[PDB]
Amino acid sequence: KTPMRVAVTGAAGQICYSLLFRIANGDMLGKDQPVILQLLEIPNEKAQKALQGVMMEIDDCAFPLLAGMTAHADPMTAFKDADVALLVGARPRGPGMERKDLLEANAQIFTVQGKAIDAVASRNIKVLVVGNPANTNAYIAMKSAPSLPAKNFTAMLRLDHNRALSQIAAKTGKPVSSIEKLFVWGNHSPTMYADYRYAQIDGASVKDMINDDAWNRDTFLPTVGKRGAAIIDARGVSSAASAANAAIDHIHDWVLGTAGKWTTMGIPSDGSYGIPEGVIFGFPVTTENGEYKIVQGLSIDAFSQERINVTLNELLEEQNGVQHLLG
Amino acid sequence: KTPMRVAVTGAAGQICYSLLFRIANGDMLGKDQPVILQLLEIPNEKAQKALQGVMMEIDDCAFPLLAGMTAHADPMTAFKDADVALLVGARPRGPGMERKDLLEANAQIFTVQGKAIDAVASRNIKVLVVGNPANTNAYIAMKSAPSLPAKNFTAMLRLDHNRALSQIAAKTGKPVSSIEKLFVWGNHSPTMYADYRYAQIDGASVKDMINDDAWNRDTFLPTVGKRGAAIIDARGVSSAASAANAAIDHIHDWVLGTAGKWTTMGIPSDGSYGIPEGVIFGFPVTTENGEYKIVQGLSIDAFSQERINVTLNELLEEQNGVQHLLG
């Protein structure tokens, strides 16, 4: 079938080094789906040279699905006719930088890329923001592309979801693939709320299987919440490969469908569960025919409401902080 | 079906960081083949801690095929009942080191691992050496495991093969997947000899398509031969992801079969083409039912013989240099 154009930012960086080869291998859109990679990196000579090196390696893998690949230094050319965009590049938190500095630096990046997508990308492009802060960066991009459907701007909560999935499998001693109805609410940050209240393994309640709410509060939540730091502590560097895997999972499920299984996606709120409309938030969803649908009717107990409030508050503080660049 | 135990060395290193996730994803042995990873790193605290971090990331990917995973600091436990072994870890060429120093350091590593495989691995384990010098390291391991079939010790020439494949596709403007009968002779080094004399695209001679022997000699050969250096020059670091891809290709084709297609494998010479028996050398082969078979009857012209002689000479110099550690 006809190749899909996939645009990827921060292409010479770490996450992309684990990401690009798997996309070219057919992991993201299917084994029968040819892809054209439109790679973007900052204009700097060193970065462009490094991108040239990554491209050489991809060619050296002899991937049959790779129908084309081009390098860019301008988002306007990189996003041209793109069917899917993975916004990985972002400004990391450097020395001396306060929260307001990080928010502004990223807002300047995402308003530009959002405008570029609005101008040249496919009219129904699917966008996934991976670069931190993911939810807020996705919101900025979305707000910056008024001619495009807001529902098409998503943020990656799939890494938090997969990490929660692995802690549950470990605790219950059950295969990670047998867990159903687990999902995460909120921000892709330590304030995320992995909700195991509806999760089931072979039809049995996970919550009842564990039968220990203290584990949930003092062990499960904090471990998943601080997992990225644990990896940096052990490896010395960030969790590139698992973040890349989660991005592939996100697009794969969005495009190919979950067949009834629930998953987590950071999406623009339509007001469900009392989340203000427009806020990019992690919600439990099912997907089909390239569209997602929020799972309705879940009960929100006192504990859940307080957790949801904390993560929503963090997202609102971030939004307030970039509002001025969205004039 | 029953899970296969895959042992991998230098597991906290770069090549492995691109390799492990793809093995766990089912890329190497099939999508219906569960795997158990037995990972080895040197005993040092920093290395073992980093290995713990990589393992955390793999868990965080929630791979359904991963039936188990253990970390080791001793080859004797790492190779236990291993069905396949990927010897990635090796001693890199550091400052002050002469060729004899590099050869000895690696010989000390591979005699130990070869003995360990001989003692505890599956009686029919398949071994692939990726760590440099690959051909010689494979030879040392093979010589160190007398109770195991010598034909089961192989070296990775698949990266040189894939790189040659990409240069031909680029030159002819034809899809990399349409090229048949291309292969590489010799050492996994710049003395390798990519042979395009039998290569065909849709039934047409590649050699005749290009119709320029000077390109072959002064452009094709040197480019493929120095490709790794070109990548280091561009990226600042080695070609980890494409080397990992070639390793997967090597095992995948060996185990699942090439269905008549020719590929390159560094194997112990049985004397074919006048290559001394026992020398691990790149030969064109076809594979089926987990076994390889050297393609016979190829013509070796004057140019080919001189190239074969150069690469064979390099391999013999290396062998002479480690012979004393094989007492």
Q: Which of A124, A155, A186 is the last residue of a domain?
A: A155
Contact B239 A57 (CB under 8 A): yes
Q: Checking DSSP bridges between strand A66-72 and strand A126-129, what pairing results, if any?
A: unpaired
A290's CB contacts (< 8 A; 6+ apart) are A126, A254, A255
| Residues in binding site of B for substrate | 93, 99, 132, 163
Selection from B166, B168, B228, B246 nearest residue B192 by Cα: B228
Same domain, A222 and A323: yes
Q: How far apart are alpha carbons B275 and B185 in whole angstroms?
A: 11
Q: A253: distance to nearest CA of chain B, Å?
A: 14
Mutate to test the interface with A, among B19, B61, B183, B264 (most CBs of A within 10 A): B61
Same domain, B114 and B168: no
Clarify whether residues A143 and A180 are in a common domain.
no
A259 touches chain B (CB under 8 A): no
- Same domain for A88 and A44, yes or no, is yes
A68 contacts chain B (CB < 8 A): no
Residue B46 CB partners (closer than 8 Å, separation 6+): none
For residues B149 and B270, state if they share a domain.
Answer: no
Q: How many CA atoms lie within 13 A of B257 on its CB side?
A: 4
**b (16+ CB within 10 A) / e for A250-259:** bbbbbbbbbe
Q: Which burial class, exposed, middle or buried, applies to A33 when counting CB atoms under 10 A from its CB (0-12, 13-18, 19+)?
A: middle
The three-state DSSP-derived secondary structure of chain B is CCCEEEEECCCCCHHHHHHHHHHHCCCCCCCCCCEEEEEECCCCHHHHHHHHHHHHHHHCCCCCCEEEEEEECCHHHHCCCCCEEEECCCCCCCCCCCHHHHHHHHHHHHHHHHHHHHHHCCCCCEEEECCCCHHHHHHHHHHCCCCCCHHHEEECCHHHHHHHHHHHHHHHCCCHHHEECCEEEECCCCCCEEECCCCEECCEEHHHHHCCHHHHHHHHHHHHHCHHHHHHHHHCCCCHHHHHHHHHHHHHHHHHCCCCCCEEEEEECCCHHHCCCCCEEEEEEEEECCEEEECCCCCCCHHHHHHHHHHHHHHHHHHHHHHHHHC
Q: Which residues contact A171 (CB under 8 A, 6 or more apart)?
A: A210, A215, A220
- A121 a known binding residue? no
| B176 vs A contacts (CB less than 8 Å) | 62-64
DSSP 8-state secondary structure symbol assigned to residue A274: G
Residues contacting A160, CB < 8 A, separation 6+: A184, A188, A192, A194, A224, A264, A282
Domain harbouring B290, CATH code: 3.90.110.10
A25 neighbourhood in chain B, CB within 8 Å: 22, 27
User: Is B188 an annotated catalytic residue?
Assistant: yes
Q: What is the distance between the alpha carbons of residues A32 and A28, in angstroms, rounded to a whole number?
A: 11
Taking the C-alpha atoms of residue B163 and residue A307, their distance in angstroms, rounded to an integer, is 52
Indicate if A118 and A58 belong to the same structural domain. Answer: yes
What span, in angstroms and rounded, lies between the C-alpha atoms of A251 and A268? Answer: 16
Strands A126-129 and A84-87: parallel
Is residue A118 packed enough to be buried (19+ CB in 10 Å), middle (13-18) or exposed (0-12)?
middle
Asked whether A78 and B252 are in contact (CB, 8 A), the reply is no
Are B191 and B308 in contact by the 8 Å Cβ rule? The answer is: no
Name the method of structure determination. X-ray
The residue from B155, B188, B223 where one domain ends is B155
Decide: A115 and A126 in contact? Cβ < 8 Å: no
Residues 119-158 of B with CB under 8 A from A: none
Locate the chain A residue with the closest alpha carbon to B231: A53
Residues B124 and B105 in one domain: yes
Q: How far is B320 from chain A (nearest CA, A)?
A: 32
DSSP strand pairing (A291-294 vs A280-288): antiparallel
Q: CB neighbours (10 Å) of residue B162?
A: 26
Is there a single domain that holds both residue B135 and residue B25?
yes
Assess B165–A contact: CB distance below 8 Å, yes or no: yes
Same domain for A180 and A92? no
Q: Please, where are the H alpha helices in chain A?
A: 14-24, 45-59, 75-78, 99-120, 134-143, 158-172, 206-210, 213-215, 221-225, 227-235, 240-256, 302-322
Are residues A107 and A192 part of one domain? no
Place of tokens 């799972």: A295
Helix/strand/coil for A252: helix
Contact residues on chain A for B54, CB-CB shorter than 8 A: 235
User: Nearest-CA distance from A48 to chain B in Å?
Assistant: 9
Binding site listing of B for NAD(+): 10-16, 106, 113, 130-132
- Contacts (Cβ under 8 Å, ≥6 apart) of A191: A225, A310, A311, A314
CB within 8 Å: B234 and A53:
yes
Claim to verify: residue B102 and residue B245 sit in the same structural domain: no
| Structure resolution, Å | 1.9
List the structure tokens of A283. 């919600």
d(CA B140, CA B109): 9
Domain that holds residue A213: 156-327
CB A252 within 8 A of CB B67: no
B36 touches chain A (CB under 8 A): no
Cis amide leading into B268 (omega within 30): no
How far CA B134 is from CA of A213, B86, B188, B261, B307, in Å, comes to 53, 11, 7, 24, 19
Sheet with A179-180, side-by-side order of all strands = A179-180, A200-201, A204-205
B11 and B25 inside one domain: yes
Instruction: Check if A230 contacts B (Cβ < 8 Å).
Output: yes
CATH number at residue B121: 3.40.50.720
**Number of structural domains chain B divides into:** 2
Tokens 């590099």 belong to residue: B102
Comparing CB atoms, the residue among B233, B235, B242 nearest residue A60 is B242
Count CB-CB contacts under 10 A for residue A308.
20
User: Distance, in angstroms, between B245 CA and closest chain A CA?
Assistant: 6
**Last-in-domain residue among A155, A182, A202:** A155
Residue with tokens 């307080």, as numbered in its chain: A306
